[PDB]
C-alpha cells in the first residue's frame, strides 16, 4: 500500500544520484589530465627557474669583481700618481 510509494520515489532518487555521480567522475578525470599536466610544468618551471637562478647567481659574482678591480686599479693609479709625484717634488 503506502509502502509501495516509498519504493517508487526512493528509487528515482538514487537514479538521480548515480546519474549525477556519473558526470562527476567524468570531471574528476579532466582533473587528472589538467593536473598531471600542470605537474609537468611544476618541474619544467622549477628547472627553468633554478637554471636562471644559476645564470643570475653568476651574473652577480662576475659583475661584483669588476668593482673590486676598479678599486684596485684606482689604488695603483692613485699610488702611481703619488710616486710620479714624489719624483717631481724631489728632483
Amino acid at each position: 500500500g503506502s509502502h509501495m510509494r516509498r519504493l517508487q520515489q526512493t528509487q528515482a532518487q538514487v537514479d538521480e544520484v548515480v546519474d549525477i555521480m556519473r558526470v562527476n567522475v567524468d570531471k574528476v578525470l579532466e582533473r587528472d589530465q589538467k593536473l598531471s599536466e600542470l605537474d609537468d610544468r611544476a618541474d619544467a618551471l622549477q628547472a627553468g627557474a633554478s637554471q636562471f637562478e644559476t645564470s643570475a647567481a653568476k651574473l652577480k659574482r662576475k659583475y661584483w669583481w669588476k668593482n673590486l678591480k676598479m678599486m684596485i686599479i684606482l689604488g695603483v693609479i692613485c699610488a702611481i700618481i703619488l710616486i710620479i709625484i714624489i719624483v717631481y717634488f724631489s728632483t
Binding site: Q11, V14, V18, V28, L38, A42, L45, K60, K66
Partner: protein
C-alpha cells in the same frame, strides 16, 4: 495468496534498491580514492611552486645587486681613466721640458 504476491514484489524491489545502493556506495568510495590519491599529486605541485616561487624571489633580488656595482665600477673605472690621462700628461711634460 494475495498477500504473498505483495511480499514477493516488495522484496523483489528491496534487493533492486540494495543492489543499486551498493553501486552508489562504490561511487563514493571510488571518489574518496581518486580525490585523496590526487591529494598526493597536488602537494607536489605546491611544493614545486613554493620553491619555484622562491627561486624567482631570490633570482630577481640578485639582478638588483647585479646593477648596483656597475655604476660603482663604471665610476671607479673612469675615475681611473681620469687619473690615466692625468698620468699621460704628467709624463708628456718630462718630454716637453726635456
Amino acid at each position: 495468496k494475495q498477500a504473498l504476491s505483495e511480499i514477493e514484489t516488495r522484496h523483489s524491489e528491496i534487493i533492486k534498491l540494495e543492489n543499486s545502493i551498493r553501486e552508489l556506495h562504490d561511487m563514493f568510495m571510488d571518489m574518496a580514492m581518486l580525490v585523496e590519491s590526487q591529494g598526493e599529486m597536488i602537494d607536489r605541485i605546491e611544493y614545486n611552486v613554493e620553491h619555484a616561487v622562491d627561486y624567482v624571489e631570490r633570482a630577481v633580488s640578485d639582478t638588483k645587486k647585479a646593477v648596483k656595482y656597475q655604476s660603482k665600477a663604471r665610476r671607479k673605472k673612469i675615475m681611473i681613466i681620469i687619473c690615466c690621462v692625468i698620468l699621460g700628461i704628467i709624463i708628456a711634460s718630462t718630454i716637453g721640458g726635456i
